[PDB]
Amino acid sequence: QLQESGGGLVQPGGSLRLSCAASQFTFSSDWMYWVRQAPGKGLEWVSSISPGGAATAYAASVKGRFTISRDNAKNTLYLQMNSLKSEDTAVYYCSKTRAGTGRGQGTQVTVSS
């Protein structure tokens, strides 16, 4: 089980920090991902993080302004998002695959304004 949180209403150029709590003890050995779904669009990969945190990857549209990180002792995944724009508006999910299978209920980021 996974539970995203931290979403909200923000102004263009603002920022938010998303959190994702994982209930299974397997979190420490899992690749984890942030994916998002904007209005009327499909799921889109945002970023990826290796089990130990040593390898990360980012969609080109968020490179340099988003940071994925994880705390395995707290079984929590994080996403720090900066310089948010209206096109960043979406439901954000954490997932165990880049395609978004095994996601929580998501948390909505709304940017307008």
Side-chain angles (χ1 to χ4, degrees), residues 1-23 26-113:
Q1 170 137 19
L2 306 164
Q3 203 164 120
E4 301 87 344
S5 71
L9 203 37
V10 309
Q11 214 122 8
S15 38
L16 283 174
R17 188 176 183 247
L18 311 184
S19 300
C20 160
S23 306
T26 38
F27 181 76
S28 304
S29 54
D30 286 345
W31 282 80
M32 290 297 298
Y33 310 82
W34 285 102
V35 302
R36 72 187 174 175
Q37 188 175 34
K41 284 203 290 185
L43 279 161
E44 162 188 25
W45 166 69
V46 175
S47 57
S48 307
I49 184 160
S50 69
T56 57
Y58 298 92
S61 59
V62 310
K63 172 76 190 171
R65 56 179 191 117
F66 290 15
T67 306
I68 192 172
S69 61
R70 64 189 304 154
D71 186 339
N72 288 349
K74 289 183 159 47
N75 285 291
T76 306
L77 180 72
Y78 304 106
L79 189 72
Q80 179 61 57
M81 309 167 73
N82 303 317
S83 303
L84 287 162
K85 309 304 197 184
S86 66
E87 298 77 10
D88 290 312
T89 297
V91 185
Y92 286 71
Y93 305 83
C94 56
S95 179
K96 303 178 83 295
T97 62
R98 187 186 37 196
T101 72
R103 50 186 187 274
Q105 297 307 308
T107 184
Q108 181 171 316
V109 177
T110 311
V111 201
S112 51
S113 34

